Amino acid sequence: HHHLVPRGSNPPPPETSNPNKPKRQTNQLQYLLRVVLKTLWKHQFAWPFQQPVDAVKLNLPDYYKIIKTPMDMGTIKKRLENNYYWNAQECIQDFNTMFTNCYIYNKPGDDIVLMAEALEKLFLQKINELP
Numbered sequence: 001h002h003h004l005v006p007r008g009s010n011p012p013p014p015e016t017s018n019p020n021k022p023k024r025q026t027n028q029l030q031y032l033l034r035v036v037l038k039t040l041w042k043h044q045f046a047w048p049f050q051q052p053v054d055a056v057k058l059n060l061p062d063y064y065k066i067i068k069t070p071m072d073m074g075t076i077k078k079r080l081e082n083n084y085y086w087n088a089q090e091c092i093q094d095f096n097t098m099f100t101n102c103y104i105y106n107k108p109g110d111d112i113v114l115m116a117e118a119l120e121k122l123f124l125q126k127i128n129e130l131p
């Protein structure tokens with residue numbers, strides 16, 4: 001037997017659709033999609049953040065022991081395209097949670113943290129210029 005099974009796995013990803021959740025369109029939300037997310041999405045440091053962390057594929061079996069509120073721009077992007085949010089604040093907080101998770105899990109000076117820092121800086125610039 002020797003506990004070679006059951007195996008590890010990834011959690012279910014964060015929801016991208018919730019029919020009973022209040023939602024609306026606001027000019028701020030439209031710009032977070034049109035401008036903010038879309039310019040981040042194509043940055044060369046975007047690729048680790050474009051989908052939920054695959055702990056299996058990436059050999060990070062500890063990831064979901066440490067990170068309990070996962071978040072990624074793939075999820076944020078779908079939430080925006082689905083009009084899932086009530087205000088800009090909810091969307092921004094997802095972005096914050098994503099950056100914060102990366103800082104929590106890794107060490108300062110790790111390459112991944114430098115990737116997040118760069119995106120976060122760019123994020124914050126684009127954020128200053130909100131309607």
Ligand SMILES: CCc1noc2cc(OC)c(NS(=O)(=O)c3ccc(OC)cc3)cc12
Nearest residue numbers: 048049053058060101102105106110111112
């Ligand atoms: C948000 C995704 C993420 N957060 O912390 C990570 C750590 C990673 O490997 C150490 C990896 N693995 S990786 O293969 O995507 C990766 C990315 C960058 C890196 O340094 C440049 C090393 C591994 C991903 C993450």
